[PDB]
Design a protein around this ligand. Structure first.
Ligand code: CHL
Ligand code: CHL
Ligand code: CHL
Ligand code: CHL
Ligand code: CLA
Ligand code: CLA
Ligand code: CLA
Ligand SMILES: CC1=C[C@H](O)CC(C)(C)[C@H]1/C=C/C(C)=C/C=C/C(C)=C/C=C/C=C(C)/C=C/C=C(C)/C=C/C1=C(C)C[C@H](O)CC1(C)C
Ligand SMILES: CC1=C[C@H](O)CC(C)(C)[C@H]1/C=C/C(C)=C/C=C/C(C)=C/C=C/C=C(C)/C=C/C=C(C)/C=C/C1=C(C)C[C@H](O)CC1(C)C
Ligand SMILES: CC1=C[C@H](O)CC(C)(C)[C@H]1/C=C/C(C)=C/C=C/C(C)=C/C=C/C=C(C)/C=C/C=C(C)/C=C/C1=C(C)C[C@H](O)CC1(C)C
Ligand SMILES: CCCCCCCCCCCCO[C@@H]1O[C@H](CO)[C@@H](O[C@H]2O[C@H](CO)[C@@H](O)[C@H](O)[C@H]2O)[C@H](O)[C@H]1O
Ligand SMILES: CCCCCCCCCCCCCCCC(=O)O
Lengths: 213, 229, 227
């Protein structure tokens, strides 16, 4: 009934169409055990949301590089920022692990004990850290505009768009790495080359993807 | 009830109680009651600020044509130095903004004059102080509440036009209208920019990148220039 | 019952003869869904009326100005005075604004039939709109609907389907020959065996790109022919 990844093949039992983006895809039954499935749900959402920010960051800075605005390529930005701004790499990295560490550990213990981060232990904040659902921590800090607490159907549709856009961005970031490794150029340089010659400038003629070509 | 798209069904949350309700909430931003209560005040504040700015920028261009509004901050010179002017502005706006905010958080808790006990705003609504702030009302208040929102939504969209026109043409609102009226077929953005699969063409930023002001050098960037058509 | 697209074929159950020009022809079964059939019928009406105007434009223009090539009339340098070398951007501005209004009005009629059948400004001005895709009223200024509308709807769809094929002939003939549709006929009649698709096919006579007032618009033929 629900569209599946391989039309004609019955959906796995541990996939009942309840989760957003449920197309019955678990060929290696990695999410067969429930608690494991809940963990993987937060994992896909966390991976996907970072990929969406990543992809949008690379695309904008790549546009600024395509035009004459002086934005470094994604694979060269890390060195430009540290060099031009004389920023100490070790300090920045440790600061990140401090901030991410705090946010990740609080998200981790919310998964282990749902609602346990809304006791007021953190500066007396209670409701902003209770969490609505696994991988969906609404409230007034994370959902400042209330889109999750208004129109249940709109919330379900938004969840479908989020997971699908996140899986697309995760595929796009794997594409940005593979294309840079195979071509040595930027992503919007690759799109301009293809658009110029789509039949003669593609992966089949890159001299790397197909070794016998 | 008139709607933004004739023949369409408005969002369930948009019944028609609020002034300016033409059933326009495609993203569903106002389906939460407490969120709608904030956005309603935000739309009013944005509207009134924009209406005064669009009026001021047009009048300033007529009375002071030589001065481009975009370049006014750096050009306007007063004996009260930039910092002295800002300090005064900061304290005055902090007070008025907190007083207005507290009205939204606890309605009816800030209608009393804090220096004169004899003066208190009559019971009212958030976004509509009235009382001393409303000495005269020329007509039905409900009708003017529709006029205020409609004239405000237009002004908010005009300012954004004045900004983009300034960065694309380097001219004030009137000077642009005249450029367009001189050659409409060659003054529209379509006649200034064009993106096709083969190539991309965008009008250049006509705003200096940095301004030198009292030995500081203020960064002056164009808005999302990279995504410009 | 009615005549079908072939002898022996059985019409799809969803094609019973309600819509005009119904030959029970849906080899790929795209009309099985009622919602799809409604949209596709509107799409077919749009492609038919536009294609009939296109066939008539290319033919009339070819007779009046036989020196102007239809395939390359869009070039501004070929625009009739006083529109020669007019800012193409400014021209697209008028078309986008006007078309966007009329197209969203017609579109809203599809979403909610009879929801936009009134002048949004001068209230009281209303089109009858007997059937979707058939507004009438100001759109039928001579009253030809007040008769056998169904039989006229058949002539419209049939002439439209024929014009849609013809227009694509004009395009492909233009790409392989480089001439308009009356010039091609003349070249054929000039030497039927000498000038025909057998020899004309295999060559795209269209450049790869053209500079329009500073912009390169990429151009392609409908088949890999010598370009
Ligand atoms: C005695 C040992 C002890 C240990 C080992 C921990 C360990 C931890 N506590 Mg914990 N706590 C401990 C005692 C106590 N805690 C708390 C109250 C809390 C709360 C309320 C929370 C934790 C949390 C955490 C975790 C934070 C995760 C992270 O990456 O943080 C590192 C993150 C940082 C931001 C590092 C802090 C700053 C860094 C040391 C450098 C400071 C730089 C500043 C510029 C300082 C400048 C000062 C100048 C300007 C005056 C973590 C595993 C958090 C958690 O994950 O809970 C689930 C959390 O929310 N603890 C109290 C008081 C009740 C404690 C003792 O009394
Ligand atoms: C999160 C993913 C991530 C990825 C995929 C990369 C990838 C890259 N980083 Mg980078 N970084 C990442 C995070 C971060 N970097 C930096 C700070 C820097 C600097 C300062 C530099 C790079 C550099 C580079 C590039 C050179 C190869 C290298 O050393 O890679 C290391 C990373 C990986 C091999 C894998 C990363 C995890 C999967 C490369 C494309 C260099 C560069 O730009 O060269 C021109 C460089 O000098 N990064 C920070 C902040 C501290 C990061 C995260 O916090
Ligand atoms: C409140 C709205 C307000 C707006 C929309 C503008 C808009 C503008 N100011 Mg102005 N100003 C505003 C208030 C004020 N200005 C000035 C003083 C100046 C000066 C001295 C100059 C401008 C300039 C400009 C223009 C250059 C834009 C730019 O690059 O800015 C980008 C701004 C920055 C990079 C600064 C940081 C961004 C922003 C201030 C952050 C705000 C963060 C919050 C405090 C939190 C621009 C159109 C410049 C000009 O003339 O352009 C040629 C200029 O030199 N303004 C004062 C002092 C009383 C203001 C007080 O409210
Ligand atoms: C409505 C039907 C229509 C048709 C069938 C044609 C057909 C033709 N025009 Mg023409 N035009 C049409 C309308 C218009 N033209 C022009 C302006 C021109 C010019 C200036 C030129 C032509 C040219 C041509 C010829 C070659 C084009 C080609 O190979 O395509 C190439 C097509 C593409 C690269 C892609 C175009 C299709 C695209 C999918 C359309 C939809 C895109 C959307 C508008 C929006 C896209 C942005 C999104 C992502 C937001 C060809 C015979 C060229 C010519 O004469 O060459 C000798 C030429 O130079 N036309 C205008 C503006 C007034 C039109 C307005 O409606
Ligand atoms: C403060 C120094 C600074 C400078 C010199 C620039 C310069 C530039 N930025 Mg910008 N940017 C900055 C800060 C700065 N940025 C900050 C702090 C942010 C976070 C809000 C951004 C977010 C940003 C975005 C999203 C984009 C740019 C883009 C660009 C390029 C196009 C012009 C533009 O300004 O877009 C306008 C963008 C702005 C954010 C303007 C607001 C920035 C002001 C200066 C706030 C600074 C406050 C601080 C107190 C000073 C340009 C070279 C565009 C680009 O990448 O081209 C491909 C682009 O789309 N920037
Ligand atoms: C948000 C509204 C706003 C803002 C930020 C500005 C800002 C500016 N205006 Mg301007 N103006 C506005 C509205 C505004 N105007 C309106 C509505 C009009 C029509 C009446 C004008 C007419 C105008 C003219 C004719 C001129 C300016 C000029 C100027 C510039 C320097 C003059 C100056 O301000 O010195 C100091 C200003 C004062 C000492 C006046 C004090 C403020 C009055 C007395 C109190 C009113 C308070 C009011 C009730 C508060 C509500 C307003 C609302 C926006 C919140 C400056 C950047 C001058 C300029 O362009 O310089 C180059 C100039 O020639 N404006
Ligand atoms: C029946 C299958 C078939 C196939 C697979 C091809 C394939 C090809 N033909 Mg072709 N051709 C065919 C039939 C076919 N032809 C027939 C029946 C005729 C007689 C009219 C021609 C006459 C013809 C000419 C004159 C030329 C080609 C050429 C070509 C090559 C260029 C591609 C192209 O678009 O050119 C032309 C496109 C077509 C001919 C349309 C193909 C339609 C057929 C019938 C497929 C169905 C290409 C590999 C060109 C070439 O030799 O390359 C240098 C070329 O000059 N063909
Ligand atoms: C489901 C399933 C089930 C069954 O059973 C089996 C199997 C099949 C195995 C499974 C799976 C599959 C798959 C496909 C997976 C995938 C994954 C991915 C791709 C991820 C990504 C992922 C990705 C991601 C996160 C991304 C991220 C990114 C980021 C952060 C950022 C970046 C960047 C930027 C902005 C810019 C500058 O320059 C810097 C940097 C830093 C460089
Ligand atoms: C939560 C919240 C709450 C409150 O209440 C409200 C609010 C605020 C609204 C919210 C928020 C939200 C957000 C933030 C969002 C974001 C998003 C994103 C970023 C996305 C991306 C997303 C992204 C994505 C998909 C991506 C895509 C991409 C792609 C396909 C790619 C393509 C390509 C490749 C590969 C390569 C080549 O060479 C080039 C190209 C062609 C380029
Ligand atoms: C029914 C169905 C179903 C089943 O299931 C199966 C199947 C088979 C799949 C299907 C079928 C289909 C078909 C056949 C289709 C066809 C189409 C076409 C051809 C169209 C045209 C279409 C066409 C058209 C519109 C046309 C258009 C045109 C126009 C506007 C015009 C233009 C022009 C002119 C005047 C002149 C100048 O100088 C130029 C120009 C400017 C260029
Ligand atoms: C966990 C999430 C993130 C995981 C992925 C992290 C990837 C990080 C990749 C870093 C690659 C470059 O690695 C880093 O390069 C910069 C380049 O100046 C070096 O930086 C060094 O010189 C610069 C000045 O030029 C200064 O920051 C400092 O003197 C020193 O740190 C760092 O010593 C080196 O560690
Ligand atoms: C570059 C690294 C610098 C050091 C950063 C350390 C930041 C603190 C991280 C501590 C996380 C501990 C979480 C508790 C363990 C658990 O959840 O099981």
């Amino acid at each position: 009934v629900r569209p599946v990844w391989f039309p004609g093949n019955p959906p796995p039992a541990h996939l009942d169409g309840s989760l957003a983006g449920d197309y019955g895809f678990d060929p290696l039954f990695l999410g067969q055990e429930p608690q494991t499935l809940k963990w993987y749900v937060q994992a896909e959402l966390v991976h996907g949301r970072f990929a969406m920010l990543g992809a949008a960051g690379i695309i904008l800075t790549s546009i600024g590089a395509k035009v004459g605005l002086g934005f470094p390529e994604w694979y060269d930005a890390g060195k430009v920022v540290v060099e031009k701004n004389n920023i100490d790499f070790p300090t920045l990295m440790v600061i990140q692990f401090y901030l991410m560490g705090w946010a990740e550990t609080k998200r981790w213990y919310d998964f282990k004990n749902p609602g346990s981060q809304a006791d007021g232990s953190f500066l007396g904040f209670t409701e902003e850290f209770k969490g609505l659902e696994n991988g969906y921590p609404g409230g007034r800090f994370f959902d400042p505009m209330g889109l999750s607490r208004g129109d249940a159907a709109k919330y379900q549709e938004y969840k479908q768009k989020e997971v699908k856009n996140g899986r697309l961005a995760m595929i796009a970031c794997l594409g940005f790495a593979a294309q840079y490794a195979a071509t040595g150029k930027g992503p919007l340089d690759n799109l301009a080359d293809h658009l110029a010659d789509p039949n003669h400038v593609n992966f089949a003629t890159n001299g790397v993807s197909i070794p016998i070509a | 009830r008139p709607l933004w798209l004739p023949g369409s069904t408005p969002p369930a949350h948009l019944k028609g109680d609020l002034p300016g309700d033409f059933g326009f909430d495609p993203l569903g931003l106002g389906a939460n009651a407490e969120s709608l209560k904030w956005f309603k005040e935000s739309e009013l504040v944005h509207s009134r600020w924009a209406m005064a700015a669009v009026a001021g920028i047009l009048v300033q261009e007529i009375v002071r044509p030589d001065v481009f509004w975009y370049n006014a901050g750096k050009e306007v010179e007063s004996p009260l130095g930039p910092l002295g002017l800002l300090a005064v502005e900061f304290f005055l706006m902090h007070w008025v903004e907190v007083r207005r905010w507290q009205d939204l958080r606890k309605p009816g808790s800030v209608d009393q004059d804090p220096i004169f006990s004899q003066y208190k705003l009559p019971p009212h609504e958030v976004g509509y102080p009235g009382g001393v702030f409303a000495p005269f009302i020329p007509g039905d208040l409900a009708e003017l509440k529709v006029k205020e929102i409609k004239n405000g939504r237009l002004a908010m969209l005009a300012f954004v036009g004045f900004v983009m026109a300034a960065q694309v043409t380097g001219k004030g609102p009137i000077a642009a209208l005249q450029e367009h009226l001189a050659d409409p077929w060659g003054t529209t953005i379509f006649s200034k920019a064009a993106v096709v699969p083969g190539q991309a063409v965008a009008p250049p930023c006509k705003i200096p990148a940095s301004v030198s002001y009292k030995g500081i050098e203020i960064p002056t960037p164009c808005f999302l220039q990279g995504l410009w058509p | 019952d009615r005549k079908l697209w072939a002898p022996g074929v059985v019409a799809p159950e969803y094609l019973k003869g309600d819509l005009a020009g119904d030959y029970g022809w849906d080899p790929l079964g795209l009309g099985a869904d009622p919602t799809a059939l409604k949209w596709y019928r509107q799409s077919e009406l749009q492609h038919a009326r536009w294609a009939m105007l296109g066939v008539a434009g290319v033919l009339v223009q070819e007779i009046v100005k036989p020196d102007v090539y239809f395939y390359e009339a869009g070039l501004p340098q070929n625009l009739p005075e006083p529109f020669t070398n007019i800012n193409m951007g400014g021209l697209l501005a008028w078309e986008f604004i006007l078309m966007h209004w009329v197209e969203v009005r017609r579109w809203q009629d599809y979403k909610n039939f009879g929801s936009v059948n009134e002048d949004p400004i001068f209230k009281g001005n209303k089109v009858p709109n007997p059937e979707m895709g058939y507004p009438g009223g100001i759109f039928d200024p001579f009253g030809f609907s007040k008769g056998n509308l169904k039989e006229l709807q058949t002539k419209e769809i049939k002439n439209g389907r024929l014009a849609m094929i013809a227009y694509m002939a004009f395009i492909l003939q233009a790409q392989a020959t480089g001439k308009g549709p009356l010039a091609a006929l003349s070249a054929h009649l000039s030497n039927p065996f000498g000038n025909n698709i057998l020899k004309n096919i295999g060559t795209c006579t269209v450049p790869h790109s053209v500079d329009v007032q500073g912009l390169t618009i990429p151009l392609t033929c409908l088949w890999p022919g010598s370009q």
